[PDB]
């Protein structure tokens, strides 16, 4: 089953973006739908063979074949369109859909959801929920970045290094332990705020409650 290999993408609250690559065009439109254009070359110009329009909850996938020359936006759909639902998508389209999934997924991990200003650092919880990335930009220059797997640290000097697991976590210079403690306080706070704000949104259906900035620089 397709559901057993990736989750359906979610483009809610994501800024529009047109990313060209060698074999594909993927675009997050203003409507929050996600479009993937298949591009083929014919000498003096590049065309678009098929279009994969993905809903904002990526649940409904519309795929069409117009004949078109590449443009600033995806070609408009004609009559010959096929609509599938996530669980009825045939394997022939999976690899491309997983391409869009990996794009959206990466964009979410750099699209802020909650920004929170402390007395020492600017935290940024990203949108790639659950276990969203968490950047701590200390005012003095030190960088910290937390993923579900690795934990990157940068120092004022620009010394750049990374960490795995709890083997190294405890054993470190006590100056650096302070930054992670404050960052985990911030992380717990941001996850609590996300949960409560989401629940209130569930009750109060209207304009989004994210992105959200909290506090200010001294």
């Amino acid at each position: 089953t397709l559901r057993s290999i990736t989750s359906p993408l979610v483009a809610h609250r994501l800024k529009p973006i047109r990313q060209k690559t060698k074999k594909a065009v993927v675009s997050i439109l203003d409507s929050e739908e996600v479009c993937v254009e298949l591009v083929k070359e014919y000498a003096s110009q590049e065309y678009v063979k098929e279009v994969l329009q993905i809903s904002s909850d990526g649940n409904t996938i519309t795929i069409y074949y117009p004949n078109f020359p590449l443009a600033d936006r995806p070609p408009s759909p004609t009559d010959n369109i096929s609509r599938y639902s996530f669980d009825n998508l045939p394997e022939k389209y999976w690899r491309k859909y997983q391409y869009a999934s990996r794009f959206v997924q990466l964009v979410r991990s750099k699209s802020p959801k909650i920004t929170y200003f402390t007395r020492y650092a600017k935290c940024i919880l990203m949108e790639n929920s659950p276990g969203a990335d968490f950047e701590v930009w200390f005012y003095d220059g030190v960088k910290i970045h937390k993923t579900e797997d690795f934990i990157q640290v940068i120092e004022k000097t620009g010394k750049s290094y990374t960490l795995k697991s709890e083997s190294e976590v405890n054993s470190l210079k006590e100056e650096i332990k302070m930054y992670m403690d404050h960052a985990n306080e911030g992380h717990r706070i941001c996850l609590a705020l996300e949960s409560i704000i989401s629940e209130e949104e569930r009750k109060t259906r209207s304009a989004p409650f994210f992105p959200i900035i909290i506090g200010r620089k001294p």
Partner: protein, 331 residues
């Protein structure tokens, strides 16, 4: 829904629809096909049964059912929609349904009957104008269209499950054709003292209420929740054909829903322009006088029923309607 029994008048007019020779344009060099509804229905059903897909029902939809039930009404005879109640589990069957329909296309030719090696792709690119495959949670059906021009567009739709195509009362009619396809096995033709029992249906509600709406030229709907974007455009078509709401009170609310829901589905004005230009070229291909009146009805509705907070987008669409009028106002 509820059952009704087609009277003799209705069965006769149905017979005329089913035996009317319809021309199919041939995109490209391909000759014009002189087909018939009876013939297509028979051939398609026979070959579907041969390929192992049971066809439970065959029905006649569109404005054709309404023209059968009430002679020369206001709705126009341009539509000829058929529905084949067919189970569609895997994509294999969807592809078989495409092959079967294209094969049965090959069957109508003068001397090209022996040219039984034209391929399904050249036939699609010569005779098919619109193709729609849907296999989602609730919706599950396939649609093949035939050429749309000086005659009439024949649309074949194969429904496994459908989100209950509710619309206005006046186009929710389906006629179960099986009884009449069976009736011809008779050696003599259908006469007044000797007709089959044919059954009409209404896809939501009391059938006799819809029939009344159709005789008295009424505007009605029953579940606005499941209304989507193009409802407003259909509503304006009813207006340009002198149909009135069932009660002037509630239609001010229906209008707002149609207006609001229209903006939800078409926020970008370029898509709006395409949608409108193609609607106009579909429903008023040659009705020159009807086009301007339609555009001005639309403008009236948009102006009166668009909520205040969307005034900005309101002006843009009112302006689009106006610009379309100046063109229908020169040629």
């Amino acid at each position: 829904m509820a059952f009704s029994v087609l009277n003799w008048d209705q069965v006769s007019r149905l017979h005329e629809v089913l035996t009317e020779v319809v021309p199919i344009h041939g995109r490209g060099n391909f000759p014009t096909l002189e087909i018939t509804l009876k013939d297509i229905v028979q051939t398609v059903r026979s070959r579907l049964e041969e390929a192992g897909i049971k066809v439970h029902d065959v029905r006649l939809n569109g404005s054709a059912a309404g023209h059968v039930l009430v002679k020369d009404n206001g709705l126009g005879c341009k539509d000829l929609d058929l529905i084949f109640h067919v189970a569609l589990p895997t994509e294999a069957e969807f592809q078989l349904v495409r092959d079967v329909v294209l094969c049965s296309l090959l069957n109508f030719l003068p001397e090209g009957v022996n040219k039984l090696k034209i391929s399904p792709v050249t036939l699609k690119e010569a005779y098919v104008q619109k193709l729609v495959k849907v296999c989602t949670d609730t919706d599950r059906w396939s649609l093949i269209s035939l050429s749309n021009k000086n005659g009439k567009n024949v649309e074949l739709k194969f429904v496994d499950s459908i989100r209950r195509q509710f619309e206005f009362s006046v186009d929710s009619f389906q006629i179960i054709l099986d009884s009449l396809l069976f009736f011809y096995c008779s050696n003599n033709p259908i006469s007044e003292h000797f007709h089959p029992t044919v059954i009409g249906e209404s896809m939501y509600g009391d059938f006799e209420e819809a029939f009344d709406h159709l005789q008295n030229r009424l505007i009605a709907t029953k579940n606005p929740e499941e209304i989507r974007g193009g409802g407003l455009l259909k509503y304006s078509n009813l207006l340009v054909r002198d149909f009135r709401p069932t009660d002037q009170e509630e239609i001010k609310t229906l209008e707002r829903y149609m207006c609001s829901r229209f903006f939800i589905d078409f926020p970008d004005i370029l898509e709006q322009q395409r949608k409108l230009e193609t609607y106009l070229q579909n429903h008023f291909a040659e009705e020159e006088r009807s086009k301007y009146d339609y555009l001005m009805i639309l403008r009236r509705v948009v102006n009166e029923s668009t909520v205040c907070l969307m005034g900005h987008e309101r002006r843009q669409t009112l302006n689009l309607i106006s610009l379309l009028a100046l063109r229908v106002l020169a040629e």
